[PDB]
Amino acid sequence: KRLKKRIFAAVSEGCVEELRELLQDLQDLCRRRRGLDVPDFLMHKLTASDTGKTCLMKALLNINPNTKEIVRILLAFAEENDILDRFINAEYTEEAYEGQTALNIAIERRQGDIT
Amino acid sequence: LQRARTILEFEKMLPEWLRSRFRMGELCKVADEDFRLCLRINEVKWTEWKTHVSFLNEDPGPIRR
């Protein structure tokens, strides 16, 4: 089940009801796998491996008039598993233009509301 | 204009297979299917700040990798 491809295309198009179903299913399989990696598995599903981009970096590149809601739902889910400090303070590490965190997109996209 | 009159003359008197590519070739347009129409690249500068809606890639500057 390509859950990573569904959550990237859901946040790109701007649909919020599609996200919460992907948000519910990823919490569900997190309840199924709780052996040794409750923080590490939830991070690796939201974050890719080549770029290192999260679902929040992809949330802020593409802007659309649902994007205030699409962050507020998505921050509370990283708060629900106590991983928001690793989540929000995650750095782009593709080593060509690395270091650009989730905050660095927000000021550049001149969204003074959600910053 | 006067050096434009010569370049289109030398290019017309060059009957090779034209290996000299002047352009990004077959780079994608915005469509589900229409990947054609080879392209060009230029640059813009400071004024008129706005949120950027229409874009093609997730902010690289060269080709990725």
Side-chain angles (χ1 to χ4, degrees):
Chain A
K1 298 294 290 182
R2 69 287 191 277
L3 299 177
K4 293 175 72 175
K5 296 299 290 183
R6 291 177 68 95
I7 192 166
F8 287 163
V11 71
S12 299
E13 193 271 333
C15 184
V16 64
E17 295 293 327
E18 186 178 0
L19 179 64
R20 189 176 294 170
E21 296 292 326
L22 270 299
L23 188 145
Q24 185 62 255
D25 186 75
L26 188 59
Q27 181 61 258
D28 196 5
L29 202 148
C30 183
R31 294 178 67 189
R32 297 292 92 194
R33 183 175 291 173
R34 59 180 295 165
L36 78 159
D37 48 356
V38 59
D40 197 5
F41 181 74
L42 189 65
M43 184 60 69
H44 188 273
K45 298 288 103 176
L46 296 178
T47 304
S49 177
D50 194 3
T51 63
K53 287 171 66 178
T54 65
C55 62
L56 186 60
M57 290 182 182
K58 184 67 175 175
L60 294 176
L61 291 177
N62 207 167
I63 51 99
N64 199 359
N66 291 318
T67 186
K68 187 175 180 181
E69 183 66 27
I70 211 71
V71 174
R72 182 180 291 169
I73 299 299
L74 190 145
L75 291 179
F77 179 72
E79 187 177 1
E80 189 176 0
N81 211 168
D82 200 0
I83 202 57
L84 68 95
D85 187 74
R86 187 178 177 181
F87 184 74
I88 301 167
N89 295 319
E91 59 182 1
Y92 188 80
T93 55
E94 199 262 332
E95 72 259 12
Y97 58 104
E98 68 180 359
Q100 184 176 1
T101 65
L103 184 61
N104 205 166
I105 301 170
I107 292 100
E108 187 268 318
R109 289 286 190 265
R110 61 188 58 246
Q111 296 294 321
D113 196 4
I114 54 97
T115 306
Chain B
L1 189 148
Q2 288 180 354
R3 65 104 178 82
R5 181 65 178 86
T6 61
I7 170 63
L8 296 178
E9 185 177 0
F10 288 114
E11 191 268 332
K12 189 179 262 76
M13 296 301 291
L14 185 62
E16 62 178 1
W17 58 95
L18 276 77
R19 183 179 60 85
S20 296
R21 305 289 182 184
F22 59 91
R23 74 277 194 190
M24 294 296 173
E26 293 182 353
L27 267 295
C28 63
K29 194 190 278 190
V30 186
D32 290 332
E33 193 270 330
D34 193 2
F35 286 172
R36 288 186 70 181
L37 283 80
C38 60
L39 296 167
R40 187 64 181 171
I41 289 173
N42 284 316
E43 301 297 324
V44 190
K45 292 297 179 69
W46 289 276
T47 34
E48 64 189 358
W49 292 271
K50 63 181 182 179
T51 61
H52 294 285
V53 177
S54 66
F55 61 95
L56 296 175
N57 292 319
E58 299 173 355
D59 296 331
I63 187 168
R64 291 184 288 113
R65 186 66 59 85

